[model samples]
Structure formats: C-alpha cells, structure tokens
Target: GEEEKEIDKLVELFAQAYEDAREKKRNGTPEEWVRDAIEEAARRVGRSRSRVVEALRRYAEKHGKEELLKRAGITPEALKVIEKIEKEEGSLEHHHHHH
Candidate 1:
C-alpha cells in the first residue's frame, strides 16, 4: 500500500532527520540550523515539522530521551547539549507546546 510505504518512509526519515538534527546540535550548530535542516528534509518527502516533532516526541517519551537519542545515532555530548536545547527552547517546535 502506498500509504503504508509512506508511513514507513516517514518513520525512517524521522529517525534520520532526528540523527541529523542531533548531529548538528552535538557539533554546536545553532537551533536555527537544526530547524532548517529538519524542515528541508521533511519538505523533501512531503512531510511537516509538526509531524516530525510529534513522532520524535512520541519516541522520546516511549524509549526515554536518551534511548531515543541513541536510536537517532546521537553522541552523548550531543545528547547533553540537546537536553539543554530542549529545556531552553521549551519545545522542539515539532511538539505542540504553546509558550
């Protein structure tokens, strides 16, 4: 089914995009850069930031944030920084948290 394939692709891309975002963060990349990279990738596959964020949020919640980060191929240092970003930024923008 096309829909099933799309969902699978989104799941794969979500993990990849999460890894990409984590890589940028670990390397000291700015939030803007991370968001831009995710947005670009999501758009490439006809997806959206909110959807990506929601999926990430779900994974983070289910697997524990550290496990989720590990699954996303993030390093410990990057995960530490990402923890700070998540704390400061309030939300990943993919998650629906209104400030």
Candidate 2:
C-alpha cells in the first residue's frame, strides 16, 4: 500500500475525466481520456507515468468488472470503458515511435 493514496487519486482523476466524456456522449473509446488523465495524474502525484499507468490498471480491474464496485458510481462506468483495451501503449523511456 505504499502508493495507495497516489493510486486512489489517479483513479479519481481518470474516472472523472471519463465521466465527463461520457456525459458529452462522445461515444468513442474512453481509453484516450484515461491515457491523458494518467499523464496529468502523474504530475499531480509525482509518480512516473509507467508507475501511475500500472496503478490505474489494478484500480480499474478491481472496481470495473468486480461485483463489489457494481454500485460504486461514475468510476465503475469509466472503469468499464477503460478495461476494453489491455495493451500497454508507448514506453517509459519516452522514445518516439521508430518508423
């Protein structure tokens, strides 16, 4: 639980962004929202992007498909949308994609 607080807030940031996106009826993949949110959350939490990204997947897994978070809130909705993509994009080394 060393980074409990950071993970909690990271999830919060991602959930809110996703919820707002949903409210607007974007009807697109919410993955981008979570991606951008994690970057910002890393800044606010002072953690590496990879660390925050890892923390978020754990958070989303627990609360997304799990029955425990069935009635949680907008977060579950966001988590549901987020769980669709399981691939890890980019890298922590910050290298541009090699063509």
Candidate 3:
C-alpha cells in the first residue's frame, strides 16, 4: 500500500509538470507561433526558397500539381509565384547550355 501511494504521487507530479509545460507553450502570441512554425518547417526543408520551390515543382510533376497545391496551404495566387520561380530557374539553366 505504501509503494502504491508513492507511485500514484509520482504520476500526479509528472502530470502536473506536463501541464505546466503545456501552459507555458500556450503563452506565445499568434505571430510568435507563426514564426516558430515557419522556422521549424524551414529547418526540415533545409534549403533556400528557390530550391524549395524547385522541389515542390518536381513533387507536383511526379505527383499532381493540383493535388499538391491543394494541400500546400498557399493560395492559388501564391502557387503562380512558385510556378514563376521554377520557370526562372529553368530558363537560367537553359541559358547556360547556350553559352
């Protein structure tokens, strides 16, 4: 009975610590949350904007543009910007071949 009580108390203490950490996380502003999310995503993607757009373009080509765009959380207008970025990279590479 004594060991059971001690185990229960330790579980309660761990739960309280988890709740305190969660509450501290919830204190961030919307902007802070957005910034943190973007930083984390960039860290995972691990590339410059141009390279990211290139990868997305290839992913869309391999998969489907409309499908990827739908899940990207970017507006259609922003999708056009990504397209333009891919186009510019393509043209630059082609230009090098001509030289």
Candidate 4:
C-alpha cells in the first residue's frame, strides 16, 4: 500500500524532470541528461532509479499518461534508457543494513 504511493510520487517527479531535460538538453547527450535527472530524483525519493522508471513506463503504457508524457518531452530515446537498467529486477532493496 505505502510502496504504491511512493512509486506514484516518484514517477510524477520524473515526468516533470523529463520535460525540463527536453527544454534545455543540458550538460550533454540527451541520454546522459535524463540519466542524471532520473538518478537525482531517485536519490531524493530514496528509491533505485530502475524502480522509478519501471513505474513510469507502466503508467505511460497503460495510456494513463502516454500522450501527456510524450508532450512533456519523454521521447522513445529517453524511454530506451529503461533497457539499460532492467536486465534483472526483483531482487533490489532501496535500503539494506544488518538489523
């Protein structure tokens, strides 16, 4: 229950970051720009970058925000980055420490 809410909020932040990355294309390559932004957001939310993007792709693919995300400057190129991080998923934890 709580995890769903965290994912939702994290993806919402990424949606806007995608828009900013498109508007300026800052630092360097578009891929790098997006990577940096995604990581930054992930850090703030204390979640892994792949986890957040996974949620984003899911929401966009469901047509809940596909057009809006596209208009926000989230191109296929940006989405392709998903492949770079998703080779294996299902065994990561945002926090790990001996309890």
Candidate 5:
C-alpha cells in the first residue's frame, strides 16, 4: 500500500508537470518538447525515467492499448521504425516505444 500510495503521489505530481508541459507546447514547441520537460521534472524529483514511463504504460495497458496508440496517431510499425533508428543512432532524443 505504501508503494502504491507513493506511486499515486508521483502520478499526481507528474500529471501537473505534464499539463504545464502541454501548456508550454501550446505556446509553440516541438511534439515531444513538453515531454522532455516532464522527464526533466521527474528526474529532478528523483524519479527514474523508466518508472515514470512504466506508470504511464500500465495505465495505457489497462485503458486500451489500441486507443492509446490511436490517440497518439502512431502505429506499431512506425514505433519499430523509430526503435531501429534509435538503435543505430544511440540517441536519448529518440522516442521509445513503451509497449
């Protein structure tokens, strides 16, 4: 219960940060610009990148993977393509497929 509670707290904090990031992007930024900000904020709060992503992934998995992927307007094939590019380029700037 403690860990779950802590995770929930993390989610609440992260949600606010995510909204702030979206607001920043609406002010004119790249697609993942706000996400980078969220990640940075998470890191600053002593959260691992994987933990934040995992939390999101778990939520998405429960809600509906297809819907989540569709909302993002990205296909599994495209994700694979990006993964390949990341493998070759070895850049953290590349997007990761959380599935």
Candidate 6:
C-alpha cells in the first residue's frame, strides 16, 4: 500500500507537469511563458526542471506528431523535426515494467 501510494503520487506529479506544459502550448503561449508555467508547476509539486523536461519529452515521443502539435496549438511550419526515433528502438512499457 505504501509503495503504491508512492507510485501514484509520482504518476500524479508527472501528469500535472505534462498537463501544465500541454495547456500552455495549447493556448499558443510564448515559449518563455510555457517554461515559466512548467517551472511553477514543478515547484508546486517539489519536482525539478529535469523531471519536468524529461516527462514532457517522453510524452511527445509516446504520442503522434499531429496530436501533440495540435494540442500545443502549434503549426507544422513552426515546429521542426530534429530526429525521428522508431518505436521499435525501445518500449517505455517494457522499461517501466522491468523497473
């Protein structure tokens, strides 16, 4: 029960941070504004920027480009594809389950 509570809290932390980032992007807010929002969110939940960034990055990778982009209220022209990693490279579920 204790372990599950810890896991649940961690999940909630990530989810809140991710939602904050997505909502900022979805509102067409400026980059700095979004960063500020995420920073505040992390601070509220006692998390670090590294955690926030990594969570957001993983969310992006897990979701499709169009859906992610649309949610962020960003147009394709405004976004750049730096690299495309195939899903076969590694599975989050696999790594998560093992951990």
- Maximum-lDDT candidate: 4
Please give, for residues 65-91, the per-residue lDDT of candidate 3 as tens digits: 565445554345544555554465568
lDDT: the better of candidates 1 and 6: 1
The sequence of per-residue lDDT tens digits that candidate 2 reaches over residues 1-99 is 675675566666655554555566566556666556556666666677667667767665665445323322344555565444434453335465666
Backbone clash pairs for candidate 6 read none
RMSD of each: 6.5, 5.4, 16.5, 6.7, 8.3, 10.8
Q: What value of lDDT does candidate 3 attain over all alpha carbons?
A: 0.43
In model 2, which residue pairs have backbone atoms overlapping below 3 Å?
none
Q: Evaluate all candidate structures by whole-model CA lDDT and list the values in order.
A: 0.55, 0.56, 0.43, 0.62, 0.49, 0.47
Q: Which candidate has the highest TM-score of all?
A: 4
Quality of model 5 by C-alpha lDDT: 0.49
Residue runs of model 1 more than 4 Å from their true location after superposition: 1-11, 14-33, 76-99
Residue 14 of candidate 2: its Cα lDDT? 54
Output the worst ten-in-a-row residue range by lDDT, candidate 1: 2-11
Candidate 1 clash pair list: none
Q: Go through the candidates in order and give the clash count of each.
A: 0, 0, 0, 0, 0, 0
**Candidate 3 vs. true structure, TM-score:** 0.38
Sort by lDDT, best first: what order?
4, 2, 1, 5, 6, 3
lDDT for each residue of candidate 1 in 1-99, tens digit (9 for 90 to 100)? 553343334445545666566566676564444454447557766776656555545655665767755565655554455445445556575576568
Please tell me which model should have the higher lDDT, number 4 or number 6.
4
- Tens digit of lDDT per residue, candidate 5, span 1-99? 554453444445555554566567767433353245437647766876656655544544555545434433445543234234324445655577765
Model 4, span 1-99: residue lDDT tens = 655564456666776776666667655675666666677668777887876666666666655555525633576665666545454344357557786
In angstroms, how far off is 78's CA in candidate 2?
5.4
